[PDB]
Structure 1
């Protein structure tokens, strides 16, 4: 179980390196072909890689000379073939005028193993602490 814990962290790190450098297709390829990505509460999830890549192009043309970073911490995993991962995300956004911190986001991932033994994300369910607090 220790080895899976490190494997999930490695997989999440690679995922986010690709996302934050704008490689939206590489990011979608770390999801399963039917992968669910609910990135913002209220909005319906993107489902499948094509919908994921499209929803990231929407979100990023919508607000774009910017460098975002997603910092994951506080990972807890739980278990036939699938694993649930609960963790914290902190979003950072660097502009020429400075660095905006937030939001803070609890996230639940579900991972499965592919045919080649590599992990893939079946689902990612993001909450937003700012939006949770309003309600």
Structure 2
């Protein structure tokens, strides 16, 4: 189906714009790409930020503890699945450039749940991030 394909591109576009905002420190913008009740589980062991204000607050607190740095998130291996929410499985690779060099990792399998807002744009209802280092740790 042409619609399935269109949805796939749409999710890629959505995800890209989210990370363009995040990576450039536009935390409000990033939060606005989630539903008003959005769940953001960024780190295993830690409770998710729920809601836009919590996501923005969480990002601010994390930036205060750990940032002269440029982070880039790179998504690959998108697979989507099902009458109005879509699940998205994919891989994230974190890159961090600092004055003393580039760091690669961690790699993170992620599950997103996406819905369509009142204006027809996609919003992220849920982002559930796992860390491969945590998985290996045992």
Q: When the two structures are superposed, what TM-score results if normalisation uses the length of structure 1?
A: 0.99
Deviation at 1:111, TM superposition (A): 0.1
Q: Hey, what's the Cα distance between the residues in 1 that align with 2:57 and 2:72?
A: 20
| Counterpart for residue 69 of structure 1 | 72
Deviation at 1:60, TM superposition (A): 1.1
Aligned length: 135
* TM-superposition CA deviations, 1:8-46 (whole Å, max 9, x none): 000000000000000000000000000000000000000
Instruction: Give 1:134's match in structure 2, choosing from 115, 118, 137.
Output: 137
Find the residue that maps to 1:40 and give its secondary structure: coil
Unaligned segments of structure 2, at least 5 residues? none
| Counterpart for residue 93 of structure 2 | 90
Q: Hey, what's the Cα distance between the residues in 1 that align with 2:63 and 2:135?
A: 23
Deviation at 1:64, TM superposition (A): 1.3
Q: When the two structures are superposed, what TM-score results if normalisation uses the length of structure 2?
A: 0.97
Moved over 2 A (4+): none
* TM-superposition CA deviations, 1:38-88 (whole Å, max 9, x none): 000000000000000000011111111100000000000001210000000
Find the residue that maps to 1:122 and give its secondary structure: strand
CA RMSD of aligned residues (A): 0.5
